[PDB]
Symmetry: C6
Subunit: 30 residues, 6 copies
């Protein structure tokens, strides 16, 4: 339904934020 669709987009958002955390880690390392 529409409520599962919202949960699925939030899962994609969490995945992109995890990627941003990883790159900010890489910036700090440099």
């Amino acid at each position: 339904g529409e409520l599962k669709a919202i949960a699925q987009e939030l899962k994609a958002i969490a995945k992109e934020l995890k990627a941003i955390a990883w790159e900010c880690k890489a910036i700090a390392q440099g």
Copy 2:
């Protein structure tokens, strides 16, 4: 419906976060 509208805005949000991850990767590389 409003429900679908919310899911579509979350899709747009995921896309912008994907772009931020890409630019942060480039910052880390430099």
Copy 3:
């Protein structure tokens, strides 16, 4: 409605994230 209000705030969130993406691109370029 309250559901519309939520969608409108998510639109504002997408707008600010696009700006953050553009600035991170400028940081990467510099």
Copy 4:
């Protein structure tokens, strides 16, 4: 209700993201 409460927190989230955009602009300017 909680539905207005949810919109109010999203408004706060938008405000913090606007602040992040502003600081990133300043980082870019010094870049």
Copy 5:
């Protein structure tokens, strides 16, 4: 309720974004 639970997580999300804003300010100030 779960709608209250959703609002409570969004409050936590706002708090972390406030922290990110402060750290970005510190990066900018240096």
Copy 6:
């Protein structure tokens, strides 16, 4: 329920934002 699922993804989003704040703190320190 999907409403619980939504709250659980928001918890994951908060966790990744906490990580971003921590890494930005490390960038700021340098």
